C-alpha cells in the first residue's frame, strides 16, 4: 500500500491514512 497517495487522497477530507506494515488505515472526519 502507498504510504502518500493513501493519506494524501485522505487529506481531501481532513482524513488521515496511516501506513504500516503493508496496512493505510485511512480516517475521515
Known amino acids: 500500500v502507498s ?3 493513501c493519506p ?3 487529506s481531501t ?3 488521515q491514512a496511516k501506513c ?3 496496512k ?3 480516517e475521515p472526519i
Open 3 to 5: 504510504c502518500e497517495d
Open 8 to 10: 494524501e487522497h485522505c
Open 13 to 15: 477530507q481532513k482524513a
Open 20 to 22: 504500516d506494515n503493508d
Open 24 to 26: 493505510c488505515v485511512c
